[PDB]
Design a protein around this nucleic acid. Structure first.
Ligand SMILES: [Zn+2]
Ligand SMILES: [Zn+2]
Ligand SMILES: [Zn+2]
Length: 87
DNA sequence: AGCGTGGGGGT
DNA sequence: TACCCCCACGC
């Protein structure tokens, strides 16, 4: 982890320079990525992408439990739901 | 529940 | 650099 953060009081280090740069957006508040539907801005392009599904209704991630028809916008929502079917 | 927004991995 | 994500914590 040679890419250290020099912002005041921060101790984080990273293996990649792009991951240090992404991290530093927390300190500066920079939000490079904008939703073309509602104009909200986001720190990260992947989170803009999943945000956009809140407008389109697309729910790609389907429960695989027999006779359950629930679907989800994001993979981790489906992880949480599968965890629940088991208990 | 639905989703904001970190870290970490890959290509 | 640009995207593709999973995992995770939190409200
Ligand atoms: Zn920092
Ligand atoms: Zn939007
Ligand atoms: Zn289900």
């Amino acid at each position: 982890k040679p890419y250290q953060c020099d912002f005041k009081d921060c101790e984080r280090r990273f293996s990649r320079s792009d991951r240090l740069k992404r991290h530093q957006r927390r300190h500066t508040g920079v939000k490079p990525f904008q939703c073309k539907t509602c104009q909200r801005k986001f720190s990260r392009s992947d989170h803009l992408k999943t945000h956009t599904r809140t407008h389109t209704g697309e729910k790609p991630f389907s429960c695989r439990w027999p006779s359950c028809q629930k679907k989800f916008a994001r993979s981790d929502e489906l992880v949480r739901h599968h965890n629940m079917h088991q208990r």
